Amino acid sequence: QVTLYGTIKAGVEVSRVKDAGTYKAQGGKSKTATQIADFGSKIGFKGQEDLGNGMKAIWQLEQKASIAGTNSGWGNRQSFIGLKGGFGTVRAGNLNTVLKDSGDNVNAWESGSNTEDVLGLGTIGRVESREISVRYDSPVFAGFSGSVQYVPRDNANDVDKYKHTKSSRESYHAGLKYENAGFFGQYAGSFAKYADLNTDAERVAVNTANAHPVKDYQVHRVVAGYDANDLYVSVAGQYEAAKNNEVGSIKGKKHEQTQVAATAAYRFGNVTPRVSYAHGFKAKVNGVKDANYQYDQVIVGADYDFSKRTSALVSAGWLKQGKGAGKVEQTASMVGLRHKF
Template identity: 55%
Template sequence: MKKSLIALTLAALPVAAMADVTLYGTIKAGVETSRSVEHNGGQVVSVETGTGIVDLGSKIGFKGQEDLGNGLKAIWQVEQKASIAGTDSGWGNRQSFIGLKGGFGKLRVGRLNSVLKDTGDINPWDSKSDYLGVNKIAEPEARLISVRYDSPEFAGLSGSVQYALNDNAGRHNSESYHAGFNYKNGGFFMQYGGAYKRHQNVDNVKIEKYQIHRLVSGYDNDALYASVAVQQQDAKLVKDNSHNSQTEVAATLAYRFGNVTPRVSYAHGFKGSFDDADLHQRLRPSGCRCGIRLLQTHFCLGFCRLVARRQRRKQI
């Protein structure tokens, strides 16, 4: 009986500590129509069209904080995908963490956005298709099982460092180091995000070193948003000491009229250098798994309309 009482007391401590819980979420869905035409020798050999209802990033989450005194707070969040099509499952599969926040900044441990992902406003589009958004330049962004520190803001300048473990799945299956900074002055802003990896294995292709750098600059005053970005990727392969690189640029312009936001984006990937053509052809069909790809130009035009947004706070 004594052991049972102790166990119940310990189990109740986290609930008592996190008394103020915020329930939040977003439902995003749409209808996408596509048409593809296959050519052979200048002749059209097939035409395919398709229409489907897709989920565009619906989520539900819980978050809270507890004042520990002396300006220090314990923070936590559990967030997961919530597809209206019922295709997503799991718990905590979006940004989920525990941490501390205070005058020193913010320290978190868990499944966290990479520093590079936090510079992703250059791609504001919600779509499952690579052709309905600036999705290719955003491919290296990820949520990683990691430790991350974000500094407080000094005169508009703040910075972040992050270390990701090698137990992340897929193409993030190696240790990686991330850093970035943000600068704001009025509506003007500048962001940098970068990452470095060693000894990565992608589709049985061994990568000795990989690095990526992205710089974003623009203006955002809540109504008008304009930004340009440049991104550079380099991968050194173990095989034959070969080197692959790619440079990409993108620009987005948007203006909000109430709940309606027309926007336009343009992206261009310059011709990269590929010492291993066989590697490039093997990686390209699977979505450029190491991030390197051929020349590509992409243009998007459209608008979005905000229907509703609500958060609910509940005392437990």
């Protein structure tokens, strides 16, 4: 058995930015942008084969396939080969991170790439990635499951494979989840002894232009709530910390940020109204308070389910980043359609 699957999703987004620094027009306000945008349409192929003993071969090849014609590539969304059995599941390939998977219970919103941070809880998801890795996922037992995942040094830095001149960027990913009676709680995190961040505090490839080497890179996320009975509520707490590891005056000093997020939704027949709030507290950068990283956002909207596979989508969002006259405000709304096949 071999299956074709995917999601086609798109809409029109209206957005405005209030940034004193970049816009001379009155009040620091940009013009209003109106755009047809793909929301992340994708297409996949997957299969499994019973090997006879409660064991199965599994594989998946998933790709970005925006209906705007902007992606190219195979295997650039989660794609793997593995084996599943009484023992649980083992997979190797371009795999979601345990943090990336936990992101499903944090940020349910659909948007284009341009509005990811205002029509979605983009910022909290900055720690989420796909990685060339191996992963183990346990069976569920007494409502408990866990995952363990690893990125090899020579996958994190191909160039240095034979010369171990740069310190290793290998990383560890792990998670622990409990479901019972509509209640859920999970822990997800990662650790990298050495890593590299851009200024937005996403991880980037070693030797990327303006990458900032760090050491002791750790992320911790806790999410909890209730999902059942037409009611959805969740709350997430995230902690990110590292040491400056770039050679210079600031080497060894502490970076850190705490983020939180909350979503609630109710199902009214075919309509699901939803609201989300998130907050980034002031970061510590080289051991000093930095309110450029602080943010506050709120998103409201609704899905209308024409069918189990097809929804109309609407949302509106209001985001504030930084403090004072350096601050950026983004407002946006969209309307959209989603079809899962």
